[PDB]
Amino acid sequence: DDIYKAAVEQLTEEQKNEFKAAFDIFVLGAEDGCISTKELGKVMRMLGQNPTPEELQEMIDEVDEDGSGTVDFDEFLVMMVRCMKDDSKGKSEEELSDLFRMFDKNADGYIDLDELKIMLQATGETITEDDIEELMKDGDKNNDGRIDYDEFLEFMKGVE
Amino acid sequence: GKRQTEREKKKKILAERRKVLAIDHLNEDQLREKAKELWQSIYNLEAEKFDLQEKFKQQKYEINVLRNRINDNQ
Amino acid sequence: DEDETTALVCDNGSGLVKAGFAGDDAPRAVFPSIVGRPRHQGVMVGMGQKDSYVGDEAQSKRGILTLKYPIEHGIITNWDDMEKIWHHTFYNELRVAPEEHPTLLTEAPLNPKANREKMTQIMFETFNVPAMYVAIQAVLSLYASGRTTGIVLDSGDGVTHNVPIYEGYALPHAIMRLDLAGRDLTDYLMKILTERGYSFVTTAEREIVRDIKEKLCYVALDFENEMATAASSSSLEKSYELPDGQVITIGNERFRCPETLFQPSFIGMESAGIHETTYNSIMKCDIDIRKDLYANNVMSGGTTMYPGIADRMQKEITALAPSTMKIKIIAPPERKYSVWIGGSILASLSTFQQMWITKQEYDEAGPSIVHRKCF
Amino acid sequence: DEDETTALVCDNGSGLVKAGFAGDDAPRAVFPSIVGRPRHQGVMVGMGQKDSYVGDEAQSKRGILTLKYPIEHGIITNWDDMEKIWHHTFYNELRVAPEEHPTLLTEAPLNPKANREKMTQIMFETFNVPAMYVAIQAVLSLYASGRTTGIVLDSGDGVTHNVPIYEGYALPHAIMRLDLAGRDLTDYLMKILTERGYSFVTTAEREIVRDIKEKLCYVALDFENEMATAASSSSLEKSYELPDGQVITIGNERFRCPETLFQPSFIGMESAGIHETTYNSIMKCDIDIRKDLYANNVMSGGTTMYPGIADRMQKEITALAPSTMKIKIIAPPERKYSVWIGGSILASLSTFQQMWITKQEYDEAGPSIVHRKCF
Ligand SMILES: Nc1ncnc2c1ncn2[C@@H]1O[C@H](COP(=O)(O)OP(=O)(O)O)[C@@H](O)[C@H]1O
Ligand SMILES: Nc1ncnc2c1ncn2[C@@H]1O[C@H](COP(=O)(O)OP(=O)(O)O)[C@@H](O)[C@H]1O
Ligand SMILES: [Mg+2]
Ligand SMILES: [Mg+2]
C-alpha cells in the first residue's frame, strides 16, 4: 500500500535506523524477533515520551489490523511515523510562505479553487471528486472559500 | 522641525557610502582602471537594485498575507 | 495596489470618510467618523489593550469605548486622531502606500484657512504623499450632478451648507452655514424619547436612534394636522425592533424630528427653516437667474436617504416664490458617495496633473503656497 | 520536586484548597477547608496528642475533633490556621519547598483589601517564596472556559458571586456577592431533616448531608406541582444508605433544598433568587451587549456537579428576558479544578514573569506595593 512508502518518505534515515536498532533491545536470542504488542510501550519510554492509557490503548489498536497479536516492521514504521508529530525535524515556514506565493497565480492573497485544480492536475493525476472534496475538508473549517497561509501550513504539516 | 535632519542624514549616508575621486590629477592609466571600477560598481549596484526591487515585491506579498490575516480576524 | 500610479481619492465628509483609488466608481473603504478609546485602564493581558479603535472595530466595540468625535461641525480636536485614522484607512483598509499616489481630498464648505494650513503641514511632514489637491464638497456634488447651474444643499453630520453656483461659478457672497445637522436631530429625538419614557445618554443609543431616523422617520406634509390625526393612529403609528428585542413604538415623533430643521423655534434658533436659508441665498444674488436657481436646486448628503425632503422643499419654495415656473429637485440614488465619484472625475482628465500640489512647492513656500495654489 | 524552578499554583477556593505545580493539568493536593482540633485535653501518651489536624487526617478523625472553619464567606479567623495548613500542603502533601518556586494564588471575589495586605505580609515574613501573584477566581474560570465574553457565576462554599466580563474586561459595577452557599444548603436541609424526624447538630452529619446533596438532590422543574405529585411518589422518592447502615428515605426534599437559593423567601432573604441577581447584573450594564451575556453565561464551582442548574437557569432567564435569541449555558465536566487549570495557564506563557511580585519590591514599599502591583 501507499501508507508504507509515505511513512518511509515522511521520516528521516537516522531516526528510523535508531528506531530499529533500538527495537532490537527486546530480542535476545531464540525468539521470533517480533515482540508482543504491550512491550512496545516500554520502548517508548526509551524514546523519551510518557504516553497515557488512552493514547496507549488507541495506538495499540493502530497495530495488527488482521489480528495476529504481533507487530511487523512495516506496521512498526507506520506506527512510529504516526507517533511523534515532529516530522522533518520541524517543518519550515519561510520558504513555505514562498510556496504560499506559489499556490496563488493571480496575486490576491489566498488560494482559489481553480488554482488548486490546475495545481493538482499539473502533477499528472486528473481531477476526481473525493480528491478535491477531502482536500477541502483537510484544509478548511468554516467554508471560507479559500486556503490562507494558516490553513496552508496546517494542511501539509510535516510534509516535505 | 526635522526639515534639515532628514535631508542631511540622507546626504551624509550617501557621502559615507560613495567615494570621492580627485579626478583632476588622475593620470591616463588611472582614468582607465577607475572608469572600469566605477562601471563595475554601477553594474553590481544595478544587480542588487534589481534584487531589492524583486524582494520589495515579495515583502509587498507578505504585507498582503498579513493584512488579509487581519481582515479575516473580525 | 494597481500597477499604475493613479491618484488616491478620499472624501473626509463631516460624518463619513470614504476613500479609494482614482478611476474607481465607488470608494472602497467607507467608515463613520466615530473614534473609540478604552473606557478604563489596563490590568489584563493576552489580547486587546490597544488605545485607538477606528472603523467597524470600534462599531463592534462601542460599549467598551468612550466614543469621541475628532471633528464636530468642522472644528478639529486632535490631529493625532486623524493621523491614526488615515494610517488605518491607507494601510489596514485601503492596503495602499501614499508614497506613490497623489491625494485628492474634499473638505467641508468654508473650512478654516488656519485649519487648512495646519492640516496640510502636519500631513506633508507626517506622510510622504507626492502631490496634493483639496476641494470644496459643493463643486464635487455639482460634478456628480454634472450640471453647472444650481444651488447645493450639503447636509453633513455637523453643518448644513447652502451654496449657489451659476454656470459653474461659486457665489461665496450667497453661501451660508447652519449649525443644524445629524447631531441636532439625534439630540431632539433623544429629548422626545425621554418624554416617551426612554432616557439614554450614551452613544450606542445615539447610533440606535439615528438608525431609527434612517428607517422609520417621516417628513410631515402638514404638521399640526398630522399630530392631530396621530393622536390615536393605530395604523400610522410605527414600531421598531431594537437589537435587544424590545419593541419600541413611535408615532408623530417620526415626522416631528426632521421638522425641527424646518421649524428651528422648537429648540430655539433665531434662524428660520433651511428653506428660508435657501430663499434668502437666492435673492441675495441678481434677480434674473433666481428662477434657474429655483429650477436647478440640488440636495446632497447621507441624510438625503430619508423620504420627504423633496416634496417639502418644492411646496415651501413655491409658497415663498411665485408659482409661474415649475420647480423640480434632482437627487440621484446613493448620492452620499457622489462626492467621491466627482473626485474620480477630477482624476479622469489629463489637465488635473497640471495643478497637483507637489512636495517641492510646499518645501519652498511652506504651507502658505496653498493660499496661492488652490485659490 | 521537578528539576526546573517552575511556579506553584494554588487555588485557595472558599471550600476547597487545590495546590500543585505549574505546567500540570490538575492540582496534586486537593483537600476541603475544614480544620479539626482536639475536643479534650491530654492525659494519655504513646501516640497522637497533636493539636492541628488537617486534610484527610481530620476527615478520618472528624468524630474526635471540634471541626472549625478558618474561613467563612471570606472572613478570616486565625492566620495561624492558614500557616499550619499551608505548611502541611507544601511539605507533607506537595513535598515542595516554597523557597525555589514563585506562587500564583486565587482569591475569593471582592476579598477585603486589608485582608490581602495582612495575608501578604504574614506570608512574606513567615515564608520565603521568591515571587507572588494573586488573582480573582472569576478571570481564572474565564480562562478555563477560554472565552473573553460571559457572566461568571462562582458558587463557592461561603459566597455566590455574579461577575460580568465582556471581551476580557471586568465589570465591578455589575458584580454582586450573595450570602447563600453550601453552608445555607446544609442548614436548610438540616431543618427539613429535623422535620423528618432526624435532628443532628454536629459537623459529621453536616458532611453526611452534603454528601446526600451531592448524590440524590434534584432541582425541581416545577416546584409546587412536584411536591403535589411527591405526596406519595413511591418511585420518585429516593433513599440513601448511611455509613452506619440505616436507610434514610427522602422525597420532595431532594428538590426542595437547592430551591432555596432560587426562592430565598423560604428562610428570609430580601434578595430574590440568584437568577434575579444575574438578571439585574446584566441590565446594569449597557443594553446592547446584554444579549451576548444571555448567550455566554458560565457557571463555576464544586456545587455545579449537581444536576438541574442548567435547565432551571435557561428557562427562568428566558422567562425574564425576551425569547428571541437562544440562551445556552456552558459548563465543562470537573470544573471545580478549572480555576487551578487557569493558574497553570497563567504560568504557561513567558510574559507572566514580567509581573511577579518579588521579595525586594515588598521590602521596599511594604505590603502597600500590591495596591499598585496587582491593580
Ligand atoms: N444609508 C443611510 N440612510 C440614511 N441616512 C444615512 C445613511 N448613511 C448615512 N446616513 C446619515 O448621514 C450622516 C452623515 O452625513 P455625510 O454623508 O457624512 O455628510 P457629507 O455629505 O457632508 O459627508 C449620518 O449622520 C447618518 O445619519
Ligand atoms: N464531587 C462533588 N460533587 C458535588 N459537589 C461537590 C463535589 N466536590 C465538592 N462539592 C461541593 O462544592 C463545595 C465547595 O465549593 P468550591 O469548589 O470550594 O468553591 P470555589 O469554586 O469557590 O472554590 C462543597 O461545599 C461541596 O458541597
Ligand atoms: Mg453632506
Ligand atoms: Mg466556587
Swiss-Prot record, chain A:
One of its GO terms (biological process) is transition between fast and slow fiber. One of its GO terms (molecular function) is troponin I binding. Residues 15-50, 51-86, 91-126, 127-160 form the EF-hand domain. SMART domains: EFh. Changing residue 144 to E: In CMH13; increases calcium sensitivity of the myofilaments. Pfam families: EF-hand_7, EF-hand_8. It comes from the Eukaryota. Ca(2+) 3 binds at residues 140, 142, 144, 146, 151. GO terms for cellular component: cardiac Troponin complex; cytosol; sarcomere; troponin complex. Ca(2+) 1 binds at residues 64, 66, 68, 70, 75. The modification Phosphoserine is found at residue 97. Ca(2+) 2 binds at residues 104, 106, 108, 110, 115. It is linked to Cardiomyopathy, dilated, 1Z: A disorder characterized by ventricular dilation and impaired systolic function, resulting in congestive heart failure and arrhythmia. Patients are at risk of premature death. Cardiomyopathy, familial hypertrophic, 13: A hereditary heart disorder characterized by ventricular hypertrophy, which is usually asymmetric and often involves the interventricular septum. The symptoms include dyspnea, syncope, collapse, palpitations, and chest pain. They can be readily provoked by exercise. The disorder has inter- and intrafamilial variability ranging from benign to malignant forms with high risk of cardiac failure and sudden cardiac death. Troponin is the central regulatory protein of striated muscle contraction. Tn consists of three components: Tn-I which is the inhibitor of actomyosin ATPase, Tn-T which contains the binding site for tropomyosin and Tn-C. The binding of calcium to Tn-C abolishes the inhibitory action of Tn on actin filaments. Belongs to the troponin C family. Cardiac muscle Tn-C can bind 3 calcium ions per molecule. Domain I does not bind calcium. This is Troponin C, slow skeletal and cardiac muscles. It comes from Homo sapiens (Human). The gene is TNNC1.
Curated annotation (Swiss-Prot), chain B:
The modification Phosphothreonine is found at residue 5. It comes from the Eukaryota. Disulfide bonds: none annotated. Residues 1-11 have a biased composition (Basic and acidic residues). Phosphorylation at Thr-5 by PRKCA induces significant reduction in myofilament calcium sensitivity and actomyosin ATPase activity. Heart. The fetal heart shows a greater expression in the atrium than in the ventricle, while the adult heart shows a greater expression in the ventricle than in the atrium. Isoform 6 predominates in normal adult heart. Isoforms 1, 7 and 8 are expressed in fetal heart. Isoform 7 is also expressed in failing adult heart. It is linked to Cardiomyopathy, familial hypertrophic, 2: A hereditary heart disorder characterized by ventricular hypertrophy, which is usually asymmetric and often involves the interventricular septum. The symptoms include dyspnea, syncope, collapse, palpitations, and chest pain. They can be readily provoked by exercise. The disorder has inter- and intrafamilial variability ranging from benign to malignant forms with high risk of cardiac failure and sudden cardiac death. Cardiomyopathy, dilated, 1D: A disorder characterized by ventricular dilation and impaired systolic function, resulting in congestive heart failure and arrhythmia. Patients are at risk of premature death. Troponin T is the tropomyosin-binding subunit of troponin, the thin filament regulatory complex which confers calcium-sensitivity to striated muscle actomyosin ATPase activity. Belongs to the troponin T family. This is Troponin T, cardiac muscle. It comes from Homo sapiens.
Curated annotation (Swiss-Prot), chains C, D:
One of its GO terms (molecular function) is actin monomer binding. Oxidation of Met-44 and Met-47 by MICALs (MICAL1, MICAL2 or MICAL3) to form methionine sulfoxide promotes actin filament depolymerization. MICAL1 and MICAL2 produce the (R)-S-oxide form. The (R)-S-oxide form is reverted by MSRB1 and MSRB2, which promotes actin repolymerization. Its main location: cytoplasm. Its EC number is 3.6.4.-. The modification N6-malonyllysine is found at residue 61. The modification Tele-methylhistidine is found at residue 73. One of its GO terms (cellular component) is stress fiber. The modification ADP-ribosylarginine is found at residue 177. The modification Methionine (R)-sulfoxide is found at residues 44, 47. Residues 110-123, 358-370 are annotated as: Interaction with alpha-actinin. Polymerization of globular actin (G-actin) leads to a structural filament (F-actin) in the form of a two-stranded helix. Each actin can bind to 4 others. Interacts with alpha-actinin. Identified in a complex composed of ACTA1, COBL, GSN and TMSB4X. Interacts with TTID. Interacts (via its C-terminus) with USP25. Belongs to the actin family. In vertebrates 3 main groups of actin isoforms, alpha, beta and gamma have been identified. The alpha actins are found in muscle tissues and are a major constituent of the contractile apparatus. The beta and gamma actins coexist in most cell types as components of the cytoskeleton and as mediators of internal cell motility. Actins are highly conserved proteins that are involved in various types of cell motility and are ubiquitously expressed in all eukaryotic cells. This is Actin, alpha skeletal muscle. It comes from Oryctolagus cuniculus. The lineage of its organism: Eukaryota, Metazoa, Chordata, Craniata, Vertebrata.
